[PDB]
């Protein structure tokens, strides 16, 4: 798993690698109400449920 702050991996005697996550989603921020909710849920799962 890749956390927000990033991951570092070392293999043998080689140099380490670095990875960072990037935003993606299957919803849309414009259009019908039920598609608006999905957009924010997939980015900030915990705050969306509390606020709603």
């Amino acid at each position: 798993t890749v956390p927000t702050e990033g991951l570092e991996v070392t293999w043998g005697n080689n140099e380490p690698y670095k990875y960072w996550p990037q935003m993606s989603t299957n919803g849309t921020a414009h259009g019908h109400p039920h598609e608006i909710i999905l957009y924010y849920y997939e980015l900030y799962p915990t705050m969306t449920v509390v606020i709603v």
Partner: protein, 439 residues
């Protein structure tokens, strides 16, 4: 003119600041951080290495009794055995068949190889810090180097810089550390003069050139076998060899915040904690008067594309009419949008192009070009790549940043409910007033 700014402790991300002085044109500076180093103060306690055992030849005395005296050498031992009858290759050694004795002795010294293979114990104290920067100044790159505290000042091309102090005192080293050929470990080594028979610290010395050695290994002499001449003994094996085979992972692979470790001298580099304030003093001859700079009178904005990825995913076109040929600065008036370009050249009646990056779903911002402002707006799409190899170049979002369509729906629901409360309350007020008056 004195200017003060604050920069976060992140390597590889450029930042910009605006300088504004009445009566003169505005100026924009760009800064980028390349390295930060911490270095503690160290003190030596003792060193350890392997040992050697010395056994001189036995003394065999037949038809008699022998004895031995005490000596001051480390781990000295003597013993006397009776009833021996040794043999050699040509026959028995001595004529007497009884009343013989044997004497044996041994002691412990320091190995010769300690000058090359050794480990050292240190005690650590407060560390210092240093930093190096790149600054874009009047169209040229210049470099500065200074200590990260307020007690140093440098001058490059008649500009004075002062950096520090840091906001945090976090360090990855504890009070006691151990160093061996490029590795640093955190370990609570035993006190001097209080060693153990089979662990780290059985042999101790103060310097590789010293003559005093402390030893706490076990040494017991045993009875020789029948018909043989030899000196058997029992002893605990060396503790330095054992440590090498089970020492575990080093500090480089376990430290937090992504710090790197080096040992000659001991250092820690590129720890991302805190932030660093910076102060700069700019001379008067570097400024240009408002009457000499060109003026721009008419503007419009259009945005053909936007994708809110971690890179520069935007493009913008601005139209302008200028009074004369010259140079101009570009600076953004909002915090959630960053613009790469620092300056442009303006002439006649034409257009200019810029690029930007942002995390907003719906983008609205202002752009300032030589003391005038223009309004831009557009809609943005999400990306498709899940993982990349470089950090983001924009800041995070707050609770107030919400798409315009989402805000519209909140307003209708909240307003509609509130009206029903408003109308119901008016009925109640009227009924009480009537009942009061009727009575």
């Amino acid at each position: 003119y004195e200017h003060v700014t604050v920069i976060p402790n992140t390597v590889g991300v450029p930042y910009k600041t605006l300088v504004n002085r009445p009566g003169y044109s505005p100026m924009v500076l760009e800064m980028e951080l390349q390295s930060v180093t911490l270095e503690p103060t160290l003190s030596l306690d003792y060193i350890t290495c392997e040992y050697k055992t010395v056994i001189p030849s036995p003394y065999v005395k037949c038809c008699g009794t022998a004895e031995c005296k005490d000596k001051s050498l480390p781990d000295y031992s003597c013993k006397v055995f009776t009833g021996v009858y040794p043999f050699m290759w040509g026959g028995a050694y001595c004529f007497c068949d009884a009343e013989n004795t044997q004497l044996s002795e041994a002691h412990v010294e320091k190995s010769e190889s300690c000058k090359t293979e050794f480990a050292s114990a240190y005690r650590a104290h407060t560390a210092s810090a240093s930093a190096k920067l790149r600054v874009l100044y009047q169209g040229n790159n210049i470099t500065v180097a200074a200590y990260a505290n307020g007690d140093h000042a440098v001058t490059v091309k008649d500009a004075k810089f002062v950096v520090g102090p840091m906001s945090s005192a976090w360090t990855p080293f504890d009070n006691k550390i151990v160093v061996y050929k490029g590795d640093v470990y955190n370990m609570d080594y035993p006190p001097f003069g209080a060693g153990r028979p089979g662990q780290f610290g059985d042999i101790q010395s103060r310097t590789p050139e010293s003559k005093d050695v402390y030893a706490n290994t076990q040494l017991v002499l045993q009875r020789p076998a029948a018909g043989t001449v030899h000196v058997p003994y029992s002893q605990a094996p060396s503790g330095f060899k054992y440590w090498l085979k089970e020492r575990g992972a080093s500090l480089q692979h376990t430290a937090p915040f992504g710090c790197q470790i080096a040992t000659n001298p001991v250092r820690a580099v590129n720890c991302a904690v805190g932030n660093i304030p910076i102060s700069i003093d700019i001379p008067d001859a570097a400024f240009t008067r408002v009457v000499d700079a060109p003026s721009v009178t008419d503007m419009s904005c259009e945005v053909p594309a936007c994708t809110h990825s971690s890179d520069f995913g935007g493009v913008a076109i601005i139209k302008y009419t200028a009074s004369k040929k010259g140079k101009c600065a570009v600076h953004s008036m909002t915090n959630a949008v960053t613009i790469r370009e620092a300056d442009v050249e303006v002439e006649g009646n034409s257009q200019l192009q810029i690029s930007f990056s942002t995390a907003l779903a719906s983008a609205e911002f202002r752009v300032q070009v030589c003391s005038t402002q223009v309004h831009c707006a557009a809609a943005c799409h999400p990306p498709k790549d899940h993982i990349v190899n470089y950090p983001a170049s924009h800041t995070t979002l707050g609770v107030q940043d919400i798409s315009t369509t989402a805000m519209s729906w909140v307003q209708k629901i909240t307003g509609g409910v509130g009206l029903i409360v408003a109308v119901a309350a008016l009925i109640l007020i009227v009924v009480l007033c009537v009942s009061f008056s009727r009575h």
